[PDB]
């Protein structure tokens, strides 16, 4: 993805991991077609939600620009307003 996108993620990946719950976000990204079932199970299989978030984010970082917007929309749609706000800097399109 874009430099600013990938970097915006990295800049806030810690605050994200410390708060976000992956299941609802993966439901969105799966529906959007930006996350696969296998990828989803690798994330779900993680022992703690911080690692699941960490794995998701790890995956999204190697993804295209549309996945950055899918993750951003999911966060908003799921109530993670402040964290979506922090990522607005990185590219946000759609909402």
């Amino acid at each position: 993805m874009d430099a600013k996108a990938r970097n915006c993620l990295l800049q806030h990946r810690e605050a994200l991991e410390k708060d976000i719950k992956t299941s609802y976000i993966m439901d969105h990204m799966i529906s959007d077609g930006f996350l696969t079932i296998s990828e989803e199970e690798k994330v779900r299989n993680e022992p703690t939600q911080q690692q699941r978030a960490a794995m998701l984010i790890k995956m999204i970082l190697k993804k295209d620009n549309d996945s950055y917007v899918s993750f951003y929309n999911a966060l908003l749609h799921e109530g993670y307003k402040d964290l979506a706000a922090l990522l607005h800097d990185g590219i946000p399109v759609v909402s």
Partner: protein, 97 residues
């Protein structure tokens, strides 16, 4: 076994499904129609927090592994459970071919 069209359909429809699926009365129909085997059914019911959503999510993920008739069989269970709108949506989509 389950083709890409049906797998893709279950993916693009993830939200609608996990938001709408009612599993309480499905258990016996999934068993009665042999869509899933008794041990998988319990795995699904015990998925995550065991919440309706977590169960519904695990159900539709496992569905990909049940063969070519997994979807139409799933649709039949939905119908005998009275989940007509959900069954209708899925049918219209597979029939749109």
């Amino acid at each position: 076994s389950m083709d890409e069209a049906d797998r893709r359909l279950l993916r693009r429809c993830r939200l609608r499904l996990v938001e709408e699926l009612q599993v309480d009365q499905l258990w016996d129909v999934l068993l009665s129609r042999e869509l899933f085997r008794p041990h998988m059914i319990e795995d699904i019911q015990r998925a995550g927090s065991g919440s309706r959503r977590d169960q519904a999510r695990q159900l539709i993920i496992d569905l990909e592994t049940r063969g070519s008739q997994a979807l139409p069989l799933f649709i039949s269970c939905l119908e005998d459970t009275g989940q007509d709108m959900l069954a209708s949506f899925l049918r219209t989509n597979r029939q749109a071919g």
